């Protein structure tokens, strides 16, 4: 409704919290803002979390309305020892 | 395989790299987070040939389990079409391990073009089927 949905994201075990710590935020600011907002709301680093969103991956070069991510788009927040892009550098060191 | 792996693998020539990288995922099964985070120091290797190695590790980690976020298709799909023959070997094989018996139409469909991709080498095909 009202062009918005709830993202059911998944966080990892090592960051000890509610294992699936949801990641609530807007969807209009760019993916650069996405890791900014995927990190700002529920206490994550803008550059220490990747969000594999709805069987896909964040394209943080694009906004959440354009990067393939969107509202309601569930993601596994791998405990990427560096950013999404920095685990697109770290998790991608082996990816 | 978790501390000096770059050193360890470097003494394996091609297929040696493939095997060593894949064990990285099998060393940590049933952890799409810990393993996938133990999957962050090799695959993008200067000999990117080992990408199949972590792709098997990528697929292997998801084998025997199912995550709601469908990690196996996401990471693997972008490289199942990778032109390099070795890059694809890990993709299709690792994907098969991850979703073995899943029968998911998407992954099955995505695997469909692999069969018909003539450019794919036979070794790509045999693993593909």
UniProtKB/Swiss-Prot annotation, chain A:
Q: Name what induces it.
A: By TNF, IFNG/IFN-gamma and IFNB1/IFN-beta.
Q: Which domain of life is it from?
A: Eukaryota
| Tissue spec. comment | Widely expressed with lowest expression in the pancreas for isoform 1 and in leukocytes, liver, prostate and skeletal muscle for isoform 2.
What span is annotated as the signal peptide, if there is one? Answer: none
The compartments listed are: Nucleus
Q: Subunit structure, per the record?
A: Directly interacts with NEDD8 and PSMD4/S5a, a member of the regulatory subunit of the 26S proteasome. Isoform 1 binds to NEDD8 more efficiently than isoform 2. Interacts with AIPL1. The interaction with UBD via UBA domains facilitates the linking of UBD-conjugated target protein to the proteasome complex and accelerates UBD degradation and that of its conjugates.
Relate the protein's function as given in its record: Specific down-regulator of the NEDD8 conjugation system. Recruits NEDD8, UBD, and their conjugates to the proteasome for degradation. Isoform 1 promotes the degradation of NEDD8 more efficiently than isoform 2.
Q: What is this protein called?
A: NEDD8 ultimate buster 1
Protein species of origin: Homo sapiens (Human)
Swiss-Prot record, chain B:
Q: Where are the PC repeats?
A: 19-52, 53-89, 90-124
* Entry comment describing in which tissues the protein is expressed: Found in skeletal muscle, liver, heart, brain, kidney, pancreas, lung and placenta.
Superkingdom of the source species = Eukaryota
Q: How does it assemble?
A: Component of the 19S proteasome regulatory particle complex. The 26S proteasome consists of a 20S core particle (CP) and two 19S regulatory subunits (RP). The regulatory particle is made of a lid composed of 9 subunits, a base containing 6 ATPases and few additional components including PSMD2. Interacts with RPGRIP1L. Interacts with CRY1 in a KDM8-dependent manner.
Role of this protein: Component of the 26S proteasome, a multiprotein complex involved in the ATP-dependent degradation of ubiquitinated proteins. This complex plays a key role in the maintenance of protein homeostasis by removing misfolded or damaged proteins, which could impair cellular functions, and by removing proteins whose functions are no longer required. Therefore, the proteasome participates in numerous cellular processes, including cell cycle progression, apoptosis, or DNA damage repair. Binds to the intracellular domain of tumor necrosis factor type 1 receptor. The binding domain of TRAP1 and TRAP2 resides outside the death domain of TNFR1.
Family membership noted in the UniProt record: Belongs to the proteasome subunit S2 family.
The protein depicted here goes by the name 26S proteasome non-ATPase regulatory subunit 2
Biological source species:
Homo sapiens
Record gene name: PSMD2
